Design a protein around this nucleic acid. Structure first.
Lengths: 242, 242
DNA sequence: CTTAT
DNA sequence: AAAATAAG
DNA sequence: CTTAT
DNA sequence: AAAATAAG
């Protein structure tokens, strides 16, 4: 099957990802920023017990590490952990938003290509390492001491754009090696389009091989492979339409 | 004094006015209007006793008369009577508003004329007769039966413009006979301006003589006569300014 | 929990 | 202007 | 009183 | 959206 032929490429089989070609990201602060330390509002035991195994899993994976940081933002109860990074986001320098909106992205899909594969990357932001100089920015309290992220975190205002740009760099060669394929990227949502069933097959094989080699991981459960009809970015792609 | 020389011209001395050159006004209705009869909400005895002598005075003056009309609008308590004519106003055809705003009106006042007389006409709208065909429009209940107005009423949406235009017609000749005077009209508020004190005197004498002959009445108590400084339309007119 | 709309 | 919502 | 803003 | 206001 597709699952057995590409064990590195699927999240179910290849382990947590890590984008090995991408240098750890440095997050520039605005020119006047200083750290902000917001104390953790006490969490109920129910929420803490809900969050705890997620925290432990992330620590086992090296995605969280202990630290001491002059930055601190609160975790809130849902259970799965969500960090209120609004005060960090305010102090981080803005970048240009380069992620295209889905409407315009879909305009680049010609009627000559109607064999589609749709892949979504699992834990996409976590595949991008954070430079140790920027890791203390995202610290939170866990009960005593702080933890922080060694990967690009959820809730950080620039993660979608940074991820989109990093994947574009990692897939630049794939595009050059397959000039007859159409590859649409929307952060962690990918659409490959081909003229024939066969070229979609051989293209999807190359793309999964490439993704897994680069350290990204696609969801086997949700993958729509080599179909004439697929759902992508909330559209149903059926017969040139939408 | 000015009071004794022009007894017909002042409200204090010449009786209620009546514009004898002005034909009784016909009030055209909108093309689709039919009469509206709003019942009188009961008035307290206190309000009725407050209103009663005003009603009796107006009846003595012929400004109110008994009638039976398919139109009826309510009187409200203040005591002095005020009629809610909003439903009548909605059914009466609109006219172009020709009363200038005071700012632009004052632009027509050159610096060569700095001797001023300010007159305000008392009970101005009541000087204009209503044609009997239009009198039933303004009927109200008085406790049993209806009364209505034989003169242009307060609260009617077109009274200011109709009065301004009627007075302009009645003073057209005065303007032609005194081309060196400036006469500003704002409904019932008049300003005469002249170059010298003497010409303001002889002009103010002619204007009062003319007003009284036409059936209008100026307030002697409030009159500012032949002064280099006067209050007009909320401005203080002092030394070319304002 | 707080806080932007 | 403030509670009702959505969101970090 | 009702009702427009 | 509704009470608070001004107005006929």
């Amino acid at each position: 099957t597709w699952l057995s032929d590409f064990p590195q490429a699927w999240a179910e089989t290849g382990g947590m990802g890590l984008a090995v070609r991408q240098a750890p990201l440095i997050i520039p602060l605005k020119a006047t920023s200083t750290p902000v330390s917001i104390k953790q509002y006490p969490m109920s035991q129910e929420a803490r017990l809900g969050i705890k195994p997620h925290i432990q899993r992330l620590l086992d994976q090296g995605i969280l590490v202990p630290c001491q940081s002059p930055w601190n933002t609160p975790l809130l109860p849902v259970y799965r952990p969500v960090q209120d990074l609004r005060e960090v986001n305010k102090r981080v320098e803005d970048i240009h938003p380069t992620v295209p909106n889905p409407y315009n992205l879909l305009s680049g899909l010609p009627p000559s290509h109607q064999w589609y594969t749709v892949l979504d990357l699992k834990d996409a932001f976590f595949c991008l390492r954070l430079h140790p100089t920027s890791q203390p920015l995202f610290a939170f309290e866990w009960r005593s001491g702080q933890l922080t992220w060694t990967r690009l975190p959820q809730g950080f205002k620039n993660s979608p754009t940074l991820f989109d740009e990093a994947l574009h760099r990692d897939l630049a060669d794939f595009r050059i090696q397959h000039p007859d394929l159409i590859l649409l990227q929307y952060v962690d949502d990918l659409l490959l389009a081909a003229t024939s069933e066969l070229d979609c097959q051989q293209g999807t094989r190359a793309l999964l091989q490439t993704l897994g080699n680069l350290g990204y991981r696609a969801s086997a459960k949700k993958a729509q492979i080599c179909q004439k009809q697929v759902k992508y970015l909330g559209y149903l792609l059926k017969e040139g339409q939408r």
